[PDB]
């Protein structure tokens, strides 16, 4: 029942006179905001992305980030000049808060350098993590001398994050509780092992994320079933495949069973070798170029 809100910033510094900063904001697995380097304005990716905040409340918050983006860029490159008078440099920020029932939350601000987590804002200051390069000590000391920033970050983590997200959760309640029915189909590919076959159960178009997919022989769940990774669709729905390795001839009798919250107890059951399966397969026949390698 918990929802994680995250602002993700990626900054690139190729040399002394080149930089770009791009950001995305996610509430759970729904994108709420976008902030391209090209744009002077933070953009909404939802009609409810403002939350419960007023226009004047939003402008003051955006202005703060606008001052931040310019300042961050200049601060990094001035710190580069301190340490290596190396390049290129990649910096990532993960800022936000996780929500818990009821009215309680924990905030975070993580910073990575070259793809390794090195610094976090903790309490009232910046802190290096355990196992971090010792050259960071000086930049940290330099940055911790800024009381104005410390206060502003504290306000954003302790107060502003939870206040905004609660507003987002009420504003976007309808989209978060939205139900989308999955569709499934069957295919098969050669296994890497000689004489074997890999049956694929494609499950696509479902929302929300949680799903159950298993290959069955009647009442028996096949313990060889392998869930793949969740893969996104462009319309914010999800794709997943469940594979099963079988010896040639043991395909018959098998079924792919899918359980989802949008189905309401009425599971999708696709049987291998059924009339339905034969019809779908002949609608997707092709020349098999340039199929994925098999060895």
């Amino acid at each position, epitope marked *: 029942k918990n929802y994680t809100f995250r602002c993700l910033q990626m900054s690139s510094f190729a040399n002394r006179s080149w930089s770009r900063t791009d950001s995305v904001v996610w509430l759970g697995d729904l994108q709420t905001h976008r902030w391209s380097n090209d744009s002077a304005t933070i953009s909404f990716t939802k009609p409810w992305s403002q939350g419960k905040l007023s226009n004047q409340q939003w402008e003051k918050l955006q202005h703060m980030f606008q001052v931040y983006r*310019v300042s961050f860029t200049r601060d990094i490159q001035e710190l580069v*000049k301190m340490m290596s*008078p190396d390049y290129p440099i990649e910096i990532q920020l993960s800022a936000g808060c996780e929500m818990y029932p009821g009215n309680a939350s924990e905030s975070f601000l993580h910073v990575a350098f070259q793809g390794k987590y090195v610094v976090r804002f903790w309490g009232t200051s910046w802190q290096t993590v355990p196992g971090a390069p010792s050259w960071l000590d000086l930049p940290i000391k330099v940055l911790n001398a*800024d009381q*104005g920033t410390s206060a502003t970050v504290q306000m954003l983590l302790n107060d502003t994050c939870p206040l905004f997200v609660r507003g987002l959760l009420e504003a976007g309640k309808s989209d978060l509780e939205k139900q989308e029915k999955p569709v499934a189909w069957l295919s098969s590919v050669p296994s890497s092992a000689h004489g074997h076959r890999q049956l694929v159960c494609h499950v696509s178009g479902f929302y929300p994320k949680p799903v159950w997919v298993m290959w069955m022989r009647g009442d028996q769940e096949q313990q060889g079933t392998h869930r793949g990774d969740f893969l996104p669709n462009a319309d914010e729905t999800w794709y997943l495949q469940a594979t099963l390795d079988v010896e040639a001839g043991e395909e018959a009798g098998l079924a792919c069973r899918v359980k989802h919250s949008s189905l309401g107890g009425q599971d999708i059951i696709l049987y291998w070798g059924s009339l339905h399966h034969i019809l779908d397969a002949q609608k997707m026949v092709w020349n098999h170029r340039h199929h994925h390698h098999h060895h």
Partner: T-cell receptor, first 113, second 107 residues
Framework: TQVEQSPQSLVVRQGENSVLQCNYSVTPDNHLRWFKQDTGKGLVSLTV?????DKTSNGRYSATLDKDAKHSTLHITATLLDDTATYICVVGDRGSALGRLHFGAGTQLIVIP | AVTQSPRNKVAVTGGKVTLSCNQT?????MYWYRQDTGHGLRLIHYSYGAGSTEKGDIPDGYKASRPSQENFSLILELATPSQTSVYFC???????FGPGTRLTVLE
């Protein structure tokens, strides 16, 4: 120029009060500092203004800062002869070592006996 | 306290000029400004410590050198008449300004 001072120069009678203005467009505006420069000498700090609405006082000198207006005022109460100097308005854009100071041309104060 | 030498210098066009700046404040950051009527101090070169030297807003015609924490130098390889000004040096951990150097470059 991102830091403008008015007037260019000011003539005041000894013992009266003199008012000096500062207007800036520096972003961000961390702090504002007033300096006094005697002829043929260096810059010597008079006072620092840090807060959004700030007021400061040091003997005859008293200053105010309004960050929403990006405006500052330096008051010299009961001006003396040795107060004849250039007064310079300085805005710093960081509260750290990575800051850059922005300077105004200065107001020349002439105290006539 | 911040010291500068020389305090006054008369130079020729195409000559070499080296302005010195010493501070015992033990500051890391050091700055070099010049002052001209109707402007306000403008940054020539600055340093973040021993070995560091960075371009300011107006670095053209000027070089800088930081051999140690205490010393920061402004070097004019081929002096020009436009480089006639009053030069101020500064140091910071708030900046502390030196007494200034009057330089006249003549034809």
């Amino acid at each position: 120029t991102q830091v403008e001072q008015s007037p260019q120069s000011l003539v005041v009678r000894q013992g009266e009060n003199s008012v000096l203005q500062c207007n800036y467009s520096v972003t961000p505006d961390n702090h504002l500092r007033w300096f006094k420069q005697d002829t043929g000498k260096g810059l010597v700090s008079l006072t620092v203004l840090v807060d959004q609405k700030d007021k400061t006082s040091n003997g005859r000198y008293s200053a105010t800062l309004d960050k929403d207006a990006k405006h500052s005022t330096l008051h010299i109460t009961a001006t003396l002869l040795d107060d004849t100097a250039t007064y310079i308005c300085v805005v710093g854009d960081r509260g750290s070592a990575l800051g850059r100071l922005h300077f105004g041309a200065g107001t020349q104060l002439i105290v006539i006996p | 306290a911040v010291t500068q030498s020389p305090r006054n210098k008369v130079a020729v066009t195409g000559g070499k000029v080296t302005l010195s700046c010493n501070q015992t404040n033990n500051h890391n950051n050091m700055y070099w400004y010049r002052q001209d009527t109707g402007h306000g101090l403008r940054l020539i070169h600055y340093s973040y410590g021993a070995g560091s030297t960075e371009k300011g807003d107006i670095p053209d015609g000027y070089k800088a050198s930081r051999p140690s924490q205490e010393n920061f130098s402004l070097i004019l390889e081929l002096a020009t008449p436009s480089q006639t000004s009053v030069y101020f040096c500064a140091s910071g951990d708030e900046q502390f300004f030196g007494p200034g150097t009057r330089l006249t470059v003549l034809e």
